Symmetry: C2
């Protein structure tokens, strides 16, 4: 193991808190608070303290995507839409740091208020799920200042981290990046997924990676297929774990 | 910031839990549970969750001592006497791993049961302190299996970590190392300090480092001075923070 490999391995174990193994919130299908290795490994629990809920398999995927882009010379920044406490974005910034990359940015996009209240404009599938109901139960609303604080604890808050606070329908169309190498979508709903595909995906470079964290949710999956059909996108959808998938843009 | 530097920096932040900032036990002069940055920085609190209580200044000192020995070709292993949850030894093993050192071992010596009960054989200063009384209050007794589990969580449990379970007066005289490059003493009492200086210090290589974690405790300081006077040791005692000192063996 080289210094870089050790750092990034430890950074994954730290943002997902395999080190101290915090309890999960009891919500959804999780009936007990105890830390379960297999659940944290696959990002299936709702950590009480950890900085990311995506788990080790999806952290490994993010590493693969960012490293492949760097190795192949795919131009552009990294954007995560839906960041919670910031752990996955912290990890992304750590990857760039490990390779001393000075000319790419990690964009951190969130409401910083949890899921939005349902309105009449919402897709019927989104209305039925009403994700907003879960905000407090899994401690989702996390302020911009809290996320910035978290980056600082790792020594990774600097000007290669830029924040996009607001609802995606508002922030994405005019977000000030020109190109993306990795687009990581983690907003769960048809609405959030369609907002980001519509307004950010056209800036994803050829050879770049589009990661759909929540593909197991029917509303998210519906947005993905509607978008791909509309644009004639046939790039193979590759499964990461029981939740996430990705494709590589050609 | 190279891979190695980033890894060791994160490792220090992780074993001391600057990342998630756990509460302290309320004991001694600490009257409130809150995490206080300045106290964790100087190793002055009693972490409820963190794997080491020595803090960042003493972790930095340990890094300096191990790196200097490696740089200067000082032969031998690393021994810590008094390891608690294992954080400082985990860090030591991480340093060797970062530099791909395959021919040195980290020895992890502890009762794995906390401070010993006082008897009439104890030095009067040890008897007056009666450190045993604090075992539960700071969660000091930590089993070998727990310490091994903690190493595993960082990916650092391998054949270059060897354990010496028992009281120092029993384990040190025949411990199966031949030479030390760094001897880190963290047992607080006159007795533990004198046991280890008596039985381990002769195996410290010239150019090696003797670290006294608890020099601020009068009983510990008494043993250090008695031992140095007896052996005619005059190497400068260099202060680290409000607790620890070290010297380099001529
Ligand atoms: C705590 C927040 C979390 O809530 C949840 O997980 C809530 C879910 O358990 C949800 C309730 C499930 O619905 C219920 O599943 C049960 C297994 C069914 O009951 C059994 C028994 C039975 C007899 O009914 C049988 O017929 C039937 C087949 O199975 C339920 N049946 C009534 C049908 C079914 O209702 C689910 C489908 C399964 O996983 C429904 C579909 C639409 C879905 O996937 C929705 C996801 C949601 C709402 C996720 C949020 C948001 O969490 C996010 O999840 C992502 C995947 C993560 O990556 C994170 O982004 C996370 O964000 C915090
Ligand atoms: C929780 C375990 C911890 O307990 C503790 O810290 C307990 C100590 O606060 C202890 C109580 C202090 O004694 C008390 O000090 C107070 C400051 C005095 O009160 C004031 C007020 C006054 C009016 O008395 C006046 O005279 C004057 C202003 O002092 C107290 N007076 C009553 C005199 C005096 O009692 C202490 C000296 C100062 O720190 C005494 C000397 C001998 C000492 O250093 C003992 C250390 C011990 C026993 C440490 C253990 C073990 O902790 C270890 O500490 C190491 C340094 C760490 O690295 C760890 O290894 C840790 O192990 C877990
Ligand atoms: N329409 C929308 N606009 C902006 N943010 C949204 C949104 N819908 C959901 N969110 C945000 O999406 C996030 C989903 S959870 C994100 C998990 C995170 N990637 C991790 O590493 O753990 C929440 O932080 C929530 O505030
Ligand atoms: N005489 C003795 N023999 C063996 N172990 C002892 C001892 N006296 C104290 N100990 C052990 O010394 C340790 C003191 S605390 C050690 C702190 C540790 N270095 C850290 O990094 O946080 C305890 O684990 C206790 O069990
Ligand atoms: Mg998700
Ligand atoms: Mg000490």
């Amino acid at each position: 193991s080289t210094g870089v490999e050790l750092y990034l391995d430890l950074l994954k174990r730290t943002v997902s808190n395999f080190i101290y193994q915090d309890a999960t919130h009891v919500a959804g299908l999780i009936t007990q608070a105890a830390f379960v290795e297999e659940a944290r490994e696959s990002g299936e629990d709702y950590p009480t303290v950890a900085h990311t809920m995506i788990g080790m398999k999806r952290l490994n995927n993010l590493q693969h995507c960012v490293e492949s882009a760097l190795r192949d010379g795919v131009p552009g920044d990294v954007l995560e839409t839906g960041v919670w406490r910031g752990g996955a974005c912290i990890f992304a910034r750590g990857i760039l740091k490990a390779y001393d990359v000075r000319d790419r940015t990690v964009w951190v996009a969130d409401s910083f208020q949890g899921f939005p209240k349902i309105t009449d404009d919402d897709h019927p599938m989104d209305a039925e799920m009403n994700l907003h109901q879960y905000n407090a139960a899994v401690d989702l609303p996390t302020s911009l200042a809290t996320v910035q604080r978290n980056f600082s604890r790792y020594g990774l808050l600097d000007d290669q981290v830029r924040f996009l606070p607001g609802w995606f329908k508002d922030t994405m169309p005019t977000a000030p990046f020109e190109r993306l190498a990795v687009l990581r979508m983690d907003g769960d709903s048809y609405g959030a997924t369609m907002d980001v595909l519509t307004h950010a995906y056209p800036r994803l470079s050829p050879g770049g990676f589009a990661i759909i964290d929540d593909y197991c949710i029917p509303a998210c999956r519906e947005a993905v297929h509607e978008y791909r059909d509309r644009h004639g996108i046939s790039d193979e959808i590759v499964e990461i774990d029981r939740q996430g998938v990705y494709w590589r843009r050609s």
